Coordinates of C-alpha atoms (C1' of nucleotides) and ligand atoms in Angstrom, one line a residue:
Chain U
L7 CA 78.6 130.8 95.6
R8 CA 76.5 127.7 95.4
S9 CA 75.9 125.6 98.5
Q10 CA 74.3 122.6 96.9
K11 CA 76.3 119.8 95.3
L12 CA 75.9 119.3 91.5
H13 CA 76.8 116.1 89.7
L14 CA 78.0 115.5 86.1
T15 CA 78.2 112.1 84.5
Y16 CA 81.8 110.7 84.5
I17 CA 83.7 110.0 81.4
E18 CA 86.1 107.1 81.3
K19 CA 89.8 107.8 80.4
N20 CA 89.4 105.7 77.2
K21 CA 86.3 107.5 76.1
Chain Y
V5 CA 90.3 124.2 155.2
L6 CA 93.7 125.0 156.5
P7 CA 94.5 124.0 160.1
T8 CA 94.0 126.8 162.6
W9 CA 97.7 126.7 163.8
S10 CA 98.8 127.8 160.3
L11 CA 96.5 130.9 160.2
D12 CA 97.3 134.4 161.3
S13 CA 95.1 136.7 163.3
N14 CA 93.1 137.7 160.2
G15 CA 92.4 134.1 159.2
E16 CA 94.9 133.9 156.3
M17 CA 97.8 131.4 156.0
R18 CA 100.9 132.5 158.0
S19 CA 103.5 134.1 155.8
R20 CA 107.0 132.5 155.9
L21 CA 106.2 129.0 157.1
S22 CA 108.7 126.2 157.4
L23 CA 108.2 123.1 155.2
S24 CA 109.3 121.0 158.2
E25 CA 106.4 122.4 160.3
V26 CA 103.9 121.3 157.7
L27 CA 105.6 117.9 157.3
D28 CA 105.7 117.3 161.1
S29 CA 102.1 118.4 161.7
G30 CA 100.3 115.6 159.8
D31 CA 98.2 118.3 158.0
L32 CA 99.9 118.1 154.6
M33 CA 96.7 116.8 153.0
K34 CA 94.9 120.0 154.0
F35 CA 97.7 122.2 152.5
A36 CA 97.9 120.1 149.3
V37 CA 94.2 120.6 148.4
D38 CA 94.3 124.4 149.2
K39 CA 95.3 126.9 146.6
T40 CA 97.5 128.9 148.9
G41 CA 98.8 125.9 150.8
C42 CA 99.7 124.0 147.7
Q43 CA 101.5 127.0 146.1
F44 CA 103.6 127.0 149.3
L45 CA 104.4 123.3 149.1
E46 CA 105.3 123.6 145.4
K47 CA 107.9 126.2 146.0
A48 CA 109.2 124.5 149.2
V49 CA 109.9 121.2 147.4
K50 CA 111.9 123.1 144.8
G51 CA 114.6 124.0 147.3
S52 CA 117.1 121.7 149.0
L53 CA 115.6 119.0 151.1
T54 CA 117.1 117.0 153.9
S55 CA 117.1 113.2 153.9
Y56 CA 114.2 112.8 156.3
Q57 CA 112.3 115.6 154.6
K58 CA 112.3 113.6 151.4
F59 CA 111.1 110.5 153.2
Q60 CA 108.3 112.5 154.8
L61 CA 107.3 113.7 151.4
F62 CA 107.5 110.2 150.0
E63 CA 105.3 108.7 152.7
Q64 CA 102.7 111.4 152.9
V65 CA 102.3 112.2 149.2
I66 CA 103.1 108.9 147.3
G67 CA 103.3 106.5 150.2
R68 CA 99.6 105.9 151.1
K69 CA 97.2 104.7 148.4
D70 CA 94.1 106.7 149.4
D71 CA 96.0 109.9 150.0
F72 CA 97.9 109.5 146.7
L73 CA 94.7 109.1 144.8
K74 CA 93.0 112.0 146.5
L75 CA 96.0 114.3 145.7
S76 CA 96.4 113.0 142.2
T77 CA 92.7 113.8 141.4
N78 CA 92.9 117.2 143.0
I79 CA 93.0 120.4 141.0
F80 CA 96.0 121.5 143.2
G81 CA 97.4 118.3 144.7
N82 CA 98.3 116.8 141.3
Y83 CA 101.1 119.3 141.0
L84 CA 102.6 118.2 144.3
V85 CA 102.3 114.6 143.4
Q86 CA 104.3 115.1 140.2
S87 CA 107.0 117.0 142.0
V88 CA 107.3 114.3 144.7
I89 CA 107.4 111.6 142.0
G90 CA 110.2 113.6 140.3
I91 CA 112.1 113.9 143.6
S92 CA 111.5 110.2 144.3
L93 CA 113.0 109.2 140.9
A94 CA 116.0 111.5 141.5
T95 CA 116.8 110.0 144.9
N96 CA 118.7 106.8 144.5
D97 CA 118.8 105.7 148.2
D98 CA 118.2 102.1 149.4
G99 CA 114.4 102.5 149.4
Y100 CA 114.3 103.5 145.8
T101 CA 113.2 100.1 144.6
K102 CA 110.2 99.7 147.0
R103 CA 109.1 103.2 146.4
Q104 CA 108.7 103.0 142.6
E105 CA 107.3 99.5 143.0
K106 CA 104.6 100.8 145.4
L107 CA 104.0 103.8 143.0
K108 CA 103.5 101.4 140.1
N109 CA 101.1 99.3 142.1
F110 CA 99.1 102.4 143.0
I111 CA 98.7 103.6 139.5
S112 CA 98.3 100.2 137.9
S113 CA 95.3 99.3 140.2
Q114 CA 93.5 102.5 139.2
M115 CA 94.9 103.0 135.7
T116 CA 91.8 103.7 133.7
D117 CA 90.2 105.8 136.5
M118 CA 93.3 108.0 136.7
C119 CA 93.6 108.3 132.9
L120 CA 90.1 109.6 132.5
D121 CA 90.5 112.2 135.3
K122 CA 91.3 115.7 134.3
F123 CA 94.1 116.0 136.9
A124 CA 95.2 112.4 137.5
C125 CA 96.1 111.9 133.8
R126 CA 98.8 114.5 134.3
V127 CA 100.4 112.3 137.0
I128 CA 100.3 109.4 134.6
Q129 CA 101.9 111.4 131.8
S130 CA 104.7 112.7 134.0
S131 CA 105.2 109.2 135.3
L132 CA 105.6 107.7 131.8
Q133 CA 108.1 110.4 130.9
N134 CA 110.3 110.2 134.0
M135 CA 110.1 106.7 135.4
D136 CA 112.4 103.8 134.7
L137 CA 111.5 102.3 131.4
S138 CA 111.0 98.9 132.9
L139 CA 108.5 100.5 135.4
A140 CA 106.8 102.7 132.8
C141 CA 106.1 99.7 130.7
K142 CA 104.3 98.1 133.6
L143 CA 101.9 101.1 133.6
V144 CA 101.3 100.4 129.9
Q145 CA 100.5 96.8 130.7
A146 CA 97.8 98.1 133.1
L147 CA 95.9 99.8 130.2
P148 CA 92.7 97.9 129.3
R149 CA 92.8 95.6 126.2
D150 CA 89.0 95.4 125.6
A151 CA 86.4 97.9 124.6
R152 CA 87.4 100.3 127.4
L153 CA 90.4 101.2 125.2
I154 CA 87.9 103.1 123.0
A155 CA 87.1 105.4 126.0
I156 CA 90.8 106.1 126.6
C157 CA 91.4 107.0 122.9
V158 CA 88.5 109.4 122.6
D159 CA 88.5 111.0 126.0
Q160 CA 89.5 114.6 126.4
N161 CA 92.1 113.7 129.1
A162 CA 93.0 110.1 128.4
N163 CA 93.9 110.6 124.8
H164 CA 97.0 112.5 125.9
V165 CA 98.1 109.4 127.9
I166 CA 98.1 107.3 124.7
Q167 CA 100.0 109.9 122.9
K168 CA 102.6 110.0 125.7
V169 CA 102.9 106.3 125.5
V170 CA 103.4 106.5 121.7
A171 CA 106.2 109.1 122.2
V172 CA 108.3 107.6 125.0
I173 CA 107.5 103.8 125.1
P174 CA 109.0 101.3 122.7
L175 CA 106.5 100.1 120.1
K176 CA 106.7 96.5 121.3
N177 CA 104.8 97.5 124.4
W178 CA 102.0 99.4 122.7
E179 CA 101.6 97.5 119.4
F180 CA 98.3 96.3 120.8
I181 CA 97.0 99.8 120.5
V182 CA 97.8 99.8 116.8
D183 CA 96.0 96.5 116.4
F184 CA 93.0 97.8 118.3
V185 CA 92.5 101.0 116.3
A186 CA 93.2 99.3 113.0
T187 CA 90.2 97.0 113.6
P188 CA 87.3 98.0 111.3
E189 CA 84.8 98.4 114.0
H190 CA 87.2 100.7 115.9
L191 CA 89.0 102.7 113.1
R192 CA 86.0 104.7 111.9
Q193 CA 84.7 105.4 115.4
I194 CA 88.1 106.6 116.7
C195 CA 89.4 108.3 113.6
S196 CA 86.1 110.3 113.4
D197 CA 86.4 111.5 117.0
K198 CA 87.9 114.9 117.8
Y199 CA 90.5 113.4 120.2
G200 CA 90.7 109.9 118.7
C201 CA 91.9 111.3 115.4
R202 CA 94.8 113.0 117.2
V203 CA 95.7 109.5 118.6
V204 CA 95.6 108.0 115.1
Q205 CA 97.6 110.8 113.6
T206 CA 100.3 110.7 116.3
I207 CA 100.5 106.9 115.8
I208 CA 101.0 107.4 112.1
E209 CA 103.6 110.1 112.6
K210 CA 105.6 107.9 115.1
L211 CA 105.5 104.8 112.9
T212 CA 106.8 106.9 110.0
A213 CA 109.7 108.7 111.8
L220 CA 117.2 100.3 115.1
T221 CA 117.4 96.5 114.5
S222 CA 115.8 94.7 111.6
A223 CA 113.4 93.1 114.0
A224 CA 112.4 96.6 115.3
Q225 CA 112.0 97.8 111.7
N226 CA 109.8 94.7 110.9
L227 CA 107.7 95.6 113.9
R228 CA 107.4 99.2 112.8
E229 CA 106.6 98.3 109.1
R230 CA 104.0 95.6 109.9
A231 CA 102.2 97.9 112.4
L232 CA 102.1 100.8 109.9
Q233 CA 101.0 98.4 107.1
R234 CA 98.1 97.1 109.2
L235 CA 96.9 100.7 110.0
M236 CA 97.3 101.9 106.4
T237 CA 95.4 98.9 105.0
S238 CA 92.5 99.7 107.3
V239 CA 92.6 103.4 106.5
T240 CA 92.6 102.8 102.7
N241 CA 89.8 100.3 103.1
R242 CA 87.6 103.1 104.5
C243 CA 89.3 106.2 103.1
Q244 CA 86.2 107.3 101.3
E245 CA 84.3 107.6 104.6
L246 CA 87.4 109.0 106.3
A247 CA 88.1 111.7 103.8
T248 CA 84.6 113.1 103.9
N249 CA 84.6 113.0 107.8
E250 CA 84.8 116.1 110.0
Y251 CA 87.9 114.8 111.8
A252 CA 89.2 111.8 109.9
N253 CA 89.9 114.0 106.8
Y254 CA 93.1 115.2 108.7
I255 CA 94.3 111.5 108.7
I256 CA 93.9 111.2 104.9
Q257 CA 95.6 114.6 104.4
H258 CA 98.6 113.6 106.5
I259 CA 99.0 110.4 104.6
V260 CA 98.8 112.1 101.2
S261 CA 101.1 114.9 102.3
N262 CA 103.9 112.6 103.7
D263 CA 106.5 111.6 101.1
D264 CA 107.6 108.7 103.4
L265 CA 104.1 107.2 102.9
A266 CA 104.2 107.6 99.1
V267 CA 102.9 104.1 98.3
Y268 CA 99.8 104.7 100.5
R269 CA 99.2 108.1 99.0
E270 CA 99.0 106.8 95.5
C271 CA 96.7 104.0 96.7
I272 CA 94.4 106.6 98.3
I273 CA 94.5 108.8 95.1
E274 CA 94.0 105.8 92.7
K275 CA 91.2 104.0 94.5
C276 CA 89.3 106.8 96.4
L277 CA 89.8 110.2 94.8
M278 CA 89.9 109.4 91.1
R279 CA 86.6 109.3 89.3
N280 CA 85.1 111.2 92.3
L281 CA 87.0 114.5 92.0
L282 CA 83.9 116.7 91.1
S283 CA 81.9 115.3 94.0
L284 CA 84.6 115.3 96.6
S285 CA 85.6 118.9 95.6
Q286 CA 82.1 120.1 96.7
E287 CA 82.5 118.5 100.2
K288 CA 83.2 120.6 103.2
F289 CA 85.9 118.3 104.5
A290 CA 86.9 116.2 101.5
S291 CA 87.8 119.3 99.5
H292 CA 90.8 119.8 101.8
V293 CA 91.8 116.2 100.9
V294 CA 91.4 116.9 97.2
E295 CA 93.7 120.0 97.6
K296 CA 96.4 117.9 99.3
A297 CA 96.1 115.2 96.6
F298 CA 96.6 117.9 93.8
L299 CA 99.6 119.3 95.8
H300 CA 101.4 116.0 96.4
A301 CA 100.3 113.5 93.7
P302 CA 103.1 112.2 91.5
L303 CA 103.1 114.0 88.1
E304 CA 101.7 110.9 86.4
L305 CA 98.7 110.8 88.7
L306 CA 98.5 114.6 88.8
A307 CA 98.0 114.6 85.1
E308 CA 95.1 112.1 85.5
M309 CA 93.5 114.4 88.1
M310 CA 93.8 117.4 85.8
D311 CA 92.4 115.4 82.9
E312 CA 89.4 114.4 85.0
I313 CA 88.5 118.0 85.9
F314 CA 89.0 119.3 82.3
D315 CA 87.7 116.5 80.1
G316 CA 86.3 113.8 82.5
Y317 CA 82.7 115.0 82.8
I318 CA 79.9 115.4 80.3
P319 CA 78.7 119.1 80.4
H320 CA 75.2 119.9 81.5
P321 CA 73.0 119.3 78.4
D322 CA 71.0 122.6 79.1
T323 CA 73.5 125.2 80.3
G324 CA 76.7 123.5 79.0
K325 CA 78.7 124.1 82.2
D326 CA 81.3 121.4 82.9
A327 CA 83.1 120.3 86.1
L328 CA 85.4 123.3 86.1
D329 CA 82.3 125.6 86.0
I330 CA 80.6 123.9 88.9
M331 CA 83.7 123.8 91.2
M332 CA 84.7 127.4 90.3
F333 CA 81.4 128.7 91.7
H334 CA 80.9 126.3 94.6
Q335 CA 81.4 127.4 98.3
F336 CA 84.0 124.7 98.7
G337 CA 85.0 123.7 95.2
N338 CA 86.4 127.1 94.4
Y339 CA 89.3 126.4 96.8
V340 CA 90.1 123.3 94.7
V341 CA 90.2 125.4 91.5
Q342 CA 92.4 128.0 93.2
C343 CA 94.7 125.1 94.2
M344 CA 95.0 123.8 90.6
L345 CA 95.7 127.3 89.4
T346 CA 98.4 128.0 92.0
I347 CA 100.0 124.7 91.1
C348 CA 100.2 125.5 87.4
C349 CA 101.4 129.1 88.1
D350 CA 104.1 127.8 90.5
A351 CA 105.3 125.2 88.0
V352 CA 105.4 127.7 85.0
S353 CA 107.3 130.3 87.1
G354 CA 109.8 127.8 88.5
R355 CA 108.6 127.4 92.0
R356 CA 107.2 123.8 91.6
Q357 CA 109.0 120.6 90.4
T358 CA 108.2 119.8 86.8
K359 CA 111.0 117.2 86.1
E360 CA 110.5 113.5 86.9
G361 CA 112.4 110.7 85.4
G362 CA 114.8 113.1 83.7
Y363 CA 112.0 114.5 81.6
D364 CA 110.5 118.0 82.0
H365 CA 106.7 118.0 82.1
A366 CA 106.5 121.8 82.1
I367 CA 104.5 121.7 78.9
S368 CA 101.7 119.7 80.7
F369 CA 101.4 122.5 83.3
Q370 CA 101.3 125.0 80.5
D371 CA 98.4 123.2 78.9
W372 CA 96.5 123.0 82.1
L373 CA 97.3 126.7 82.8
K374 CA 95.9 127.6 79.4
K375 CA 92.6 125.8 80.1
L376 CA 92.3 127.4 83.5
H377 CA 93.3 130.9 82.2
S378 CA 90.8 130.6 79.4
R379 CA 87.9 129.8 81.7
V380 CA 88.8 132.6 84.1
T381 CA 88.8 135.0 81.1
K382 CA 85.5 133.6 79.8
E383 CA 83.8 134.1 83.2
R384 CA 85.8 137.2 84.4
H385 CA 82.6 139.2 84.6
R386 CA 81.0 136.9 87.2
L387 CA 84.3 136.0 88.9
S388 CA 85.2 139.7 89.5
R389 CA 82.3 139.8 92.0
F390 CA 83.8 137.0 94.2
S391 CA 86.8 137.2 96.4
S392 CA 87.8 133.8 95.1
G393 CA 87.4 135.0 91.6
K394 CA 89.4 138.1 92.4
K395 CA 92.3 135.9 93.7
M396 CA 92.3 133.8 90.5
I397 CA 92.3 137.0 88.4
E398 CA 95.2 138.4 90.5
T399 CA 97.0 135.1 90.4
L400 CA 97.0 135.2 86.6
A401 CA 97.9 138.9 86.6
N402 CA 101.1 138.2 88.6
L403 CA 102.1 135.4 86.2
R404 CA 101.6 137.6 83.2
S405 CA 103.7 140.4 84.8
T406 CA 106.7 138.1 84.5
Chain P
rC1 C1' 86.8 136.9 106.9
rU2 C1' 84.3 132.8 100.9
rG3 C1' 85.8 126.6 103.8
rU4 C1' 87.4 122.0 109.3
rG5 C1' 90.7 119.2 114.4
rA6 C1' 93.6 118.3 121.7
rA7 C1' 93.3 118.0 129.0
rU8 C1' 95.2 121.7 134.9
Ligands
NA501 NA1 90.8 130.0 103.5

RNA sequence: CUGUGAAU
C-alpha cells in the first residue's frame, strides 16, 4: 500500500 | 499520620472504631487524608447518623474553608466531601439554607482552581448534579468568561466539569460557553484538542437532542456553532481530533442541513485528496454513508469520472485510492454501500423513486476494477475483502 | 492487526 498522496487534476461536472 | 490514640499496639488503626469518637476527637482531618482512615469514614457516613453527628460532619468537612479545600483536593478526602455534600443536601433542617450558601461561596471563590484539580473537580461535578438548581447555577456563574475558559475546556480534569454543566444545567446559564467556543480564534484550538473536542461534541449532542423561547435559544446556539464549524470544516476534517466533530455532524440526521453544507462546500471536488488523509478519510466514509442520494451520486461520479487519468500509467482516482494506505478504506466503503443497496440492506428509494439502478451502475464500475486488478488485489487484505464482498453478492 | 479521540 502506498503512503504518499497522489493528485489527479479535477474535472468539472459539466466537462 | 493517624493520631496515636487510634492506633493499636502494632501501630495500625484500631479495628471497630466509633464514628463519634473520631468526630469528637478533632482529628477528622488526619483520618480523611489517610487511606485506611478515609475508608473507615466513607463506610461510617453510609449508615444512620444522629442529628449532631450530621452537624459535626457538616462543620468539620464542609464548614471551614481551608479544611474543605484541603479535603476536596486530597486523593482520599474528596470522597468524604462528596458524601457529606450529599448528606447536607438530603437534610432539610433549619440550617439548610446557610449550609449550601456557605458551600456555594467556598466553591465559587476557588472555582477555576478546583476545576483544574484532579480530585476537586469531582466535588464540583457531584455538586452540579445534586445541588439545588438555583445554587448550581451560581457555580456556573463563577466560571471564568475570559481566555481562562480555554484552559477549562482543554484540561484533562476541567473538561468534565463543562460536560457536566451541559448535561444538567439549562442552556440559558451556559450559552456563553457556546459563544466562546464558536469564536474563530477559539474553535480550532479547542476542537483540535483531545479533551476540547469532547466538549464541542457534547455541546452539539445536547443542542441536538420546551417553550418556543427555549427552542429559539437552542436553535440560535446550534446555528452559531454550526456556522463556525462549516467555515473551518476543511481544517477540522483533516485534524487528528476535530475530524470526530465533522463525522458526528455528517452522521446525524437531525443536522441534515449542516451535513449537506459540509459535503457541498468542503468534501466535493476534494474527494481524491481527502480520501488519502489519515483523519479526513474517516470523514469521507461518513459522507458516503449518510449523504442524500442526490449528493451521493455526485460523490460517486467524482470518484469514477471526475479526475483526468495519469497521462503515463493511465491510473485514475479509483486506482490511487484502491491502493492507498487510507484510501483503500474509502473504496471498501463505496463497495459495501453498493452491495447493501443491491441486496436490499440500504435505502434506494427517495421521493417515491427507486434509484437502485444508480447503485447497480456504480457497483458495475467497482466490480470491473476489482476484476481488472484482482491479481494485485489478492495480495492485500483490503483487496481480499473487496473480492470476498463481491463473492457474497454473486452468491445471491 | 492494512487506518484516529476523556479525569480518582
Ligand atoms: Na479497520
